[PDB]
Structures are given as structure tokens and as C-alpha cells.
Design a protein around this ligand. Structure first.
Ligand SMILES: O=c1[nH]cnc2c(C[N@@H+]3C[C@@H](CO)[C@H](O)C3)c[nH]c12
Ligand SMILES: O=c1[nH]cnc2c(C[N@@H+]3C[C@@H](CO)[C@H](O)C3)c[nH]c12
Ligand SMILES: O=c1[nH]cnc2c(C[N@@H+]3C[C@@H](CO)[C@H](O)C3)c[nH]c12
Lengths: 286, 286, 286
């Protein structure tokens, strides 16, 4: 197998965007789940549907793939993805992560990634926000790693390290912002495990993931982080705990998408505020 | 990637079978290992070789794939698969599970799945029968999930839950049937872990699987269950423990297919009886 | 999916080599990392670039793939691979392991495999040599097993056992050779876990692998061993611990390829000596 994209392809997509907007972003934000509305806070906003952009992964109905929104968020020149690609949809990881390498060639230096996740840590509660300190890449252990294939030194090394993936400094700076918001619940912090999905975990599977030392489980993010780190980006991310994974056989409740989207809706304002203030804490370049 | 089968394909296979038999099955039974002989107890039996049926996964020698046998088992209108597809044979999971979606469109409402499995729980003994209370889908954590790809709402939801996969009621009703048979060994119950195989586990691997909380290990079943649950089927299943996985380096014994097939032969009568009586306990439809 | 190679292909590659060298090897050595120099100790050495050999997996620049070197090492007729294929490079496992089946048809009866590995056992130290007593095949649990696909009985069984993969006798005989060398550090022994890579593990991932009972982690070897065992070869192998995997968040150190290659260089002489003496301990055939 190999990444279907040549270096020329990524460059071509970046050149195209560079020619169609005067915006020059520094921060890329992948808006996870129930956080799409964050583009409503950008100023000077210029929207591009993924369907218009050369080389972007395609959805059957071209528009449901989503859009890149360039603008300014609380001082920072941003590009936000509203709509992301998941491997459970059938995309190979070199398509899932194609935009990350584009952001880099646009001059982005920081990637913020967010998602919704199921809570594995028994102390977490629906609505909780968990900052991501580390991840467990289960698909990557098996060969599903976005860097599989010939390496291009123009982006990075053959064997990049991931032990420092999540910027220590901005997890610190985010603990600050949280007190400034004056919040009842404390800001959670922990390990995110990626599983492919799309079906939800069984009880026995949830117990496995808890014993691996994971705090939250979702179906995305890890690959983007790996590709970000590989090309030099600073990374910060968090998960909204939208549900507490079922851990025992007596329970008569089940994980469901409606309940995940509901939690998304509730935590919407909190999240957009949270991310907007944090922009000020991202270092300026140079 | 995507499922090579369109909704039309599944419908076409179901329409074909519906036109070639007057039998209308309610229960699908996937006969696992050393339980093929169960078709000898059907009455009014009509056999179809997989090679004759449109869209069915193909074996090199078309006949070795197996056959669908329609009939009546102790009162219930059944369709049994004698011969199944495994991912270790090279089939993608959307081929492995193609028949499950066909059963559904035939009007089946219940799936019974059986298999042979290696015992991980140290109390299990060769010959033991373990009812399946839950599973650990290791291939699915990595992306090998039969629902990967665009979802079709005609079968089910994008994100189906699996925590309730194994019908509580019929595990209860099966504990009954077992006492009615008056058996020496108790009916075992536990967690089935799927690994792809086809080679057998090492000692270090067996210890891993034991520590994941698995009781039995095999190379099948999970995907069919996921697809069953996804389209609304009730599911019950069990494993014949054909061997006790080697757990220490001193042992000079090794897992082997001859010994697995032997255990299959011994437990043959016990199994066919067990499943036949249980049919009476499957609710009627409506 | 299926193995792209027919039995004829393997036979054709073996016949070709058999026609182009008078050497008839008994022992195959896959030279892992910083152990390529071992070909400098062969006598009567005949080199074949992988690019010249029919059916050999191909590298973009044909020469960077490596070479087969036939010769005599301390008494034994050997064939050594200098350069190997990894799944993180994009090769399917039936390409990674193609040479193993060729060795067999050349008449090889023993496979020695070596590699560099990250230390998970906290007692190991950089420079340590760990003999491999067992392995955990994480990719294989998910379907990435070199035997996936139709089985060819000419090489072996559908379901080969792996619990006895690493020859008990020569791990014993290697403990000997080590004292004969008069070494300060003791010869380590333990479990090798394969992960696909190519990126390095996170802290949370390292803790997972430690709790699986693994002592060393690398990105190769397991598949070759599985295919070796499947066709009847005796197998012995070891890992050079080139680094101690980062296990806590305070550490400011990171795994890196330079440091791995450095450790390789240091342990070079020790390794070539170690393997050369050991040849005398490999049983003669017949
Ligand atoms: O319990 C969970 N298990 C795995 N993933 C999730 C997620 C992340 N979801 C997974 C998927 C279903 O809403 C959507 O792509 C975002 C929330 N809860 C859970
Ligand atoms: O020890 C085991 N490990 C994994 N699978 C099995 C099975 C299930 N088998 C696996 C395979 C070998 O008989 C056949 O497809 C049914 C029995 N014993 C074991
Ligand atoms: O810390 C580690 N994690 C995983 N693999 C390795 C290896 C084996 N390496 C992996 C790769 C990087 O040097 C090369 O193919 C040989 C050494 N150290 C580690």
C-alpha cells in the first residue's frame, strides 16, 4: 500500500487555498462534535466547501463532507474544519489526515483538536471536559497508522516520537482559562484511546479499555495528532464526555447517538467560549 | 474502502431464495464446528449450495463454501448455514457477514451462532459448553468492523450499541434446557474474544487474552453478531470448548486442528440435542 | 484478499538462486539492526542484490532493498538478509515474509532472526541483549497475519501452533556461548511484542505493552517467525535493547532513530561475535 497523495498534491491544494483567500492562518482547529457552531464566532470569515478544494477527501453528497472556514478568533488567524473524516466511514488514514499536511503548508503552526468521547474514568460526568494529556492508538498497533508507506522527509522523519504529543504548556494554560471562566465542575485531564468503531463498545470491551489506563474513548483524533506531530505542529486537544460507557451487565441503558448529540448541544456555549479565550494563550509565531 | 454489496444485491439474493423455496424461516442458525450434522434433524429439508445463490461469497472449489439448509427444527422454521466464512481465509468482513443481512430480508428474527473455542478460563474443560454473555472484538478496535464504510439506514443506525448483544432472556432459557437434559458438567457462561488467526496463540498471547477478561478465544462469530444486532436480530450463541489454551512454558502440548475436530465429534450428539430443544424456547414472532 | 504469490513463484525464485550459486545454505539469518556488518565475517561470500532476484519485494530505488549474501559462517552454510521489509513501509505481510518461504525451498532448516528493540522491562539497559522466548503478535490479533488467505499444504497446515515457536534447545545453548564470551552484563530473556509503527510509542502505550507482559517492543520479526514455523523451520532470535522506552510524563527524553542507530554501532562487534560462535551450536542436518 501507499499514500495516494504525492507531495505535489498537498502543495497544489495549499497553493490553491493560498490563492483564494487573503487569510493566512496560524492556528488550525478541528471542530469535533457539537462544536461546529464555533465558526459563528470567527470574524472576517471566508468559507470553502471541501467539495471545491482540490484533492480533499470526497463525501458521496459532496457538501456533507463539510467546509474549511478561515477567519480571526479572539486575535488569532485561524482555519477551522467543520466536518471531519473517520476511518469507520471507509477512508484510509492518509485521506483522514490529508488536511493536516495542508494546514502545515499554509503556514499553520498549531493544531487544536476536539471531539466527543465516552467516559471510561468512573469519576467523569456527562458534560465534563477532558483535556488530552496522552493517547493510546489501538488501530496504529495493528498497522493503521497514517504514516504507513514511504516517508517524505519534506514533512518529517521516518520514526517520529509521540511521547510528547500534547503540548505541556497549553494544558497548563488551559487549566488557567478554566478558572477564569469560573466553572463548577473541574477541568478533567487524561488519556484518550482511539478505537475505529463505528459500533459502540460492549461491557467487556469497556473494561478492557479502562484497564489499559484510558479515561476517554472515541473514534478519531489520534491520526491527525500523529500527522501534526510528524510535520512539527504544536498540538492541544480535549474531549467532551458525552456519556459514561456502560460498565456492568445489570444496567439497562445503552450508548446512543441521540444522547451524544444532546450532550453536544448542552455544552455548546461552554465550549465555544472555552476555545475562544484560549486562542489568546497560544504563542504568537516567531 | 466500501462494502462491495449494494442494498439491491442483498435484496436480489433474498428475492431469489424466496422464489426457490416455500420455506419461510424465522430462526437462522450458523452451525459452528462439529455441529454441521444438525441439518440431519431438520424436517422438510431443502438444501441450496452457496455456489448456486446469487451474490454469496465464493470458495475456490465452489462446493467447499457450504450450503444453506431450510427446514423445521423442533417446531421452528429455520435456515441453517453449514460452512461459514472467516477473515483468516482472506474474505473482507462485508463478505463474511453478507448472509446475515440476507437472513433478515428473508424475515428471520433470531440468529443462533455457534462455534468451537479455546478455553481461557482455567476452570473450563474440553467438552464444556460456554454460553456467550459478551464478546471482545479485537479486530474491530483496529478498523476490522463489518459496518465500516457508508451506512445504509435500511438495515440500521450509523452507531449501533453492542452492550446488549446477547439476549439476556435466552441465556436464561438455555440454563433451563441444560438441567432438562440432566447433564453432569454445568453449563458454562462467559466472554468470547475474537482474534483473526489462523495460527494459534502463543503462551504470552494466551495470558494477554486471559487478562483482558476473556473466557474463550476463537476466530469467528463477532462480526455476524455485530451485523445481526445492527439490523435488529435477537442473538444467542455458544462455544464448545475444544481445548484448553496452553498457558505455561513447561507444557509439551500444543493446540492442533485434529484435537479440535475430535472434541467436535464427541460433543456432536449433545450439541444437536441441546440446540433442537432450545428452538421451543425461542419466542414465536408477533 | 490473497497472497499475491503462487507456489510456482516461490519455487521459481528458489530454482533461480539454486542456479546462480553453488552455495547450499542450511541456516538463514535475518540481520536486524546494526548487525548488517555480520556479512563481513562470511567466507566464500556471494552477494545477490534483492533487485536481481525474481519475485523479491521491490524498493523504489531497487538497491536500498538490500541483498542476500550466501557463504560460510563458523562452519555453517548460511544465507543472510542484509535489509528487511517492514509493514510500516507499506508492504503486505505476504511480501514481508516472501524470503522465508524461499529459504525453506533452498533447503534452509533454521532461521535466526535479530532486531533492535525498545526496552519495556525496567531492568533492561541500553546495550543489553534479550533472547526471545516468546512474542505477542498484536497486528495478527486484528487480521494482519502473514498466513491470511488460502493455505498451501505444500508449506504447512491451515492452523499452525505458535506456543513452541522459539527453539528451547538453542536458547539454552545461547546462554552457554554468552559465558564463554565472558560478559559483564547477563544475557536477558523475555517476550517480544510486535507493533506496526513507524512512529514511537506514547507513555500510555508503553504502559499498556508493559502490562501485556512484554519485555521488548519492535516493528518486525513476528511475521517471519510465523511463516518459518509454518513451513517447519527451527527458529532462534534476539533483540538488542537500544533504548529504554519512556514510561513517565516528567522525563524530557524521547525515543529517536539516531540513538537507536548509535546503540546499534556500539553493540556491533559483540553481536557478530555472539552469532558467529553460536553457529557451531546449531545442529547439523540429518
Ligand atoms: O461511548 C463512546 N464510545 C466510542 N466513541 C464515543 C464518542 C465519539 N463519537 C463516536 C461517534 C458516535 O457519536 C461520533 O463519531 C462521535 C462518544 N461517545 C463514545
Ligand atoms: O485455541 C484456540 N484458539 C483460537 N481459536 C480456537 C478455536 C476455533 N477454531 C479455530 C480454527 C481452528 O480449529 C477453526 O476455524 C475453529 C478452537 N480452539 C482455538
Ligand atoms: O522504542 C522502540 N519502539 C518500537 N520499536 C523500536 C525499535 C526497533 N526499531 C524500530 C525502527 C526505529 O529504529 C527500526 O525499524 C528498528 C527500537 N526501539 C524501539
Amino acid at each position: 500500500m501507499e499514500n495516494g497523495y504525492t507531495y505535489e498534491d498537498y502543495k497544489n491544494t495549499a497553493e490553491w487555498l493560498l490563492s483564494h483567500t487573503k487569510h493566512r492562518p496560524q492556528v488550525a482547529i478541528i471542530c469535533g462534535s457539537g462544536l461546529g457552531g464555533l465558526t459563528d464566532k470567527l470574524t472576517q470569515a471566508q468559507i470553502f466547501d471541501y467539495s471545491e478544494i482540490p484533492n480533499f477527501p470526497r463525501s458521496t453528497v459532496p457538501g456533507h463532507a463539510g467546509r474549511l472556514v478561515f477567519g480571526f478568533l479572539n486575535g488569532r488567524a485561524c482555519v477551522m474544519m467543520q466536518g471531519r473524516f473517520h476511518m469507520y466511514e471507509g477512508y484510509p488514514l492518509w485521506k483522514v489526515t490529508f488536511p493536516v499536511r495542508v494546514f502545515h503548508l499554509l503556514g499553520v503552526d498549531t493544531l487544536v483538536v476536539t471531539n466527543a468521547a465516552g467516559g471510561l474514568n468512573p469519576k467523569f460526568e456527562v458534560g465534563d471536559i477532558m483535556l488530552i494529556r496522552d493517547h493510546i492508538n489501538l488501530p496504529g498497533f495493528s498497522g493503521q497508522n497514517p504514516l504507513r508507506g514511504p516517508n517524505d522527509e519534506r514533512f518529517g522523519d521516518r520514526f517520529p516520537a509521540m511521547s510528547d504529543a500534547y503540548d505541556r504548556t497549553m494544558r497548563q494554560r488551559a487549566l488557567s482559562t478554566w478558572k477564569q471562566m469560573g466553572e463548577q465542575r473541574e477541568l478533567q485531564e487524561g488519556t484518550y484511546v482511539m478505537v475505529a468503531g463505528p459500533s459502540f463498545e460492549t461491557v467487556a470491551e469497556c473494561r478492557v479499555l479502562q484497564k489499559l489506563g484510558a479515561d476517554a474513548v472515541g473514534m478519531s483524533t489520534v491520526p491527525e495528532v500523529i500527522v501534526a506531530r510528524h510535520c512539527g505542529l504544536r498540538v492541544f486537544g480535549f474531549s467532551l464526555i458525552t456519556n459514561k460507557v456502560i460498565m456492568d451487565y445489570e444496567s439497562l441503558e445503552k450508548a446512543n447517538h441521540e444522547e451524544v448529540l444532546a450532550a453536544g448541544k448542552q455544552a455548546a456555549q461552554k465550549l465555544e467560549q472555552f476555545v475562544s479565550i484560549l486562542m489568546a494563550s497560544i504563542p504568537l509565531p516567531d
